[PDB]
């Protein structure tokens, strides 16, 4: 098997999380429907759901009642953005986001444009950071919602959601943050951060795919127009069945990551710096995105002059990712296609880092030699 260096696409479920999830699957376990109020199979499953809701809430310093379970950060992004814009449209129909947002955010705004909303898509600077003066200049008296992601999924850059939130709160503008790539890695304290809506994905944080959550601030109260209809119902905001094993898995993953967050992230940073220092003397290599205001595990690099398909093949002993985010920060088409995303995580070893350096040094050297 190639060495996995694509943690930002998905992570393995932590084995400690697997051990908890499997208690909620088969006939020997707690398989009841959390909505079955009339027997102990249902009640036990509900208790496990609510314990996971508390685990997640504790990691971000929110209350459990502010946590709405979803099928992933895609649904959370959709529900936050469509739900808030549609609920508050009588207050104004101008919206602001960044051109570097994940498609689950951009495509939500694209839909709202068909509904008459006016959307401003701000570009970052060339290091991927939003110029907050450009944000301020874009705000209008009829701006009702802004969405800015905490960590970019391609280039790993961190936006200053603390300042953004405070600036928007003073204007009465709702602030949504896509935190899919930051939860379990960066501090999130919603008792201090002026964030109104925040999206979470379990499988970016060593939980199972197919489950996420939306934080919905209770004070000042944020309301949403829901996107689903049926049973449940997560305070009326999300209808459907509560999948006990998925939710248990998400709660346990969040608890595990937060309990060791700073040591784990600094160990990962050390490995990422080691990787970068091992490859950064290769000819025409460029690091994309701010080097330090950046999640520990992300290394996004362009090998100017080389072909992306050729890089993927030559580097096939590494499992890596090989365009609109790169264009937004100023790369040409040609530069963007020479770019790879390496991402490191909980199961990356020092031995694998040294092998990656050797593979990248050897193979990029050959591609330059064979150029």
Taking Cα atoms as reference points, which of 166, 168, 185 lies closest to residue 60?
A: 185
In whole angstroms, how close is the CB of 125 to a copy of itself at the nearest point? 26
Q: Examine residue 274 and tell whether it contacts a copy of itself (CB under 8 A).
A: no
Q: How far is the CB of 247 from a copy of itself (least distance, A)?
A: 8
Question: Is the separation of the CB atoms in 322 and 339 below 8 Å?
Answer: yes
x/- contact string, 304-333, with a copy of itself (CB under 8 A)?
--------x---x--xxxx-----------
What span, in angstroms and rounded, lies between the C-alpha atoms of 67 and 212?
Answer: 10
Q: For the chain, how are helix, strand and coil distributed in percent, rounded to 5?
A: 40, 15, 40
Selection from 182, 176, 247, 200 nearest residue 75 by Cα:
200
Q: Which is nearer to a copy of itself, 172 or 236 (CB)?
A: 236
Residues 6+ apart with CB under 8 A from 331: 288, 302, 339
Please identify which residue in the block is written with the tokens 């790539």.
181
Site for a copy of itself in 211-240 (CB under 8 A): 211, 227-231, 239-240
Minimum separation from the CB atom of position 127 to a copy of itself (A): 25
Tokens of residue 300, six digits: 């996004």
Please give the residues from 330 up to 349 whose contact with a copy of itself meets the rule CB under 8 A.
347
Distance CA 105, CA 181 (A): 14
Mapped onto helix, strand or coil, the DSSP state of residue 340 is: strand
Q: Which of 65, 137, 241, 266 binds a copy of itself (CB under 8 A)?
A: 241
Q: Tell which positions 123-162 bind a copy of itself, by CB under 8 A.
A: none
User: By the criterion CB under 8 A, which residues form the site for a copy of itself?
Assistant: 1-2, 4, 6, 9-15, 18, 21-22, 25-29, 31-33, 35-36, 38-42, 71-72, 74-75, 77-78, 82, 102-104, 107-108, 110-111, 201, 203, 208-211, 227-231, 239-246, 312, 316, 319-322, 347
């Amino acid at each position: 098997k190639p060495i996995y260096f694509d943690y930002m696409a998905t992570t393995p479920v932590d084995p400690r999380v697997v051990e908890q999830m499997i208690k909620y699957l088969g006939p020997e376990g707690d398989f009841g429907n959390p909505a079955s109020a009339t027997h102990e199979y249902g009640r036990v499953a509900s208790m496990a759901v609510e314990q996971a809701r508390s685990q997640i809430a504790e990691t971000i310093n929110a209350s459990p009642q502010e946590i709405v379970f979803t099928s992933g950060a895609t649904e959370a992004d959709n529900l936050a953005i469509l739900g808030a814009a549609r609920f508050y449209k009588n207050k104004g129909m101008h919206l602001v986001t960044m051109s570097t947002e994940h498609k689950a955010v951009l495509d939500s705004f694209h839909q709202l444009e068909k509904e008459g909303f006016q959307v401003t898509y701000l570009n970052p600077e060339s290091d991927g950071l939003l110029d907050l003066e450009k944000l301020e200049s874009a705000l209008r008296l009829d701006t009702i919602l802004v969405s800015v992601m905490h960590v970019n999924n391609e280039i790993g850059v961190i936006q200053d959601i603390a300042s953004i939130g405070e600036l928007l709160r003073n204007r009465g503008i709702i602030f949504h943050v896509d935190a899919a790539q930051s939860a379990g890695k960066l501090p999130i304290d919603l008792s201090q951060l002026s964030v109104d809506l925040m999206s979470f994905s379990a499988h970016k944080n060593y939980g199972p795919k197919g489950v996420g959550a939306l934080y919905v601030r209770h004070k000042p109260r944020i309301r949403l127009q829901p996107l689903s209809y049926g049973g449940g119902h997560e305070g009326g905001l999300r209808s459907g069945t509560l999948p006990t094993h998925q939710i248990v898995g998400m709660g346990e993953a969040f608890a595990i990551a937060e309990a060791d967050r700073i040591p784990e992230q600094t160990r990962i940073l050390n490995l990422r710096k080691q990787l970068w220092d091992g490859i950064r003397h290769l000819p025409a290599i460029k690091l994309n995105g701010h080097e330090h205001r950046r999640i520990a595990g992300n290394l996004n690099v362009s090998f100017v002059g080389l072909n992306g398909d050729s890089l993927l093949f030559a580097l096939s002993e590494l499992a890596i990712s090989t365009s609109y985010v790169l264009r937004a920060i100023g790369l040409t088409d040609t530069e963007a296609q020479s770019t790879i995303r390496l991402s490191i995580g909980r199961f990356t070893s020092e031995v694998q880092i040294k092998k990656a350096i050797d593979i990248i040094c050897t193979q990029v050297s050959r591609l330059h030699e064979l150029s």
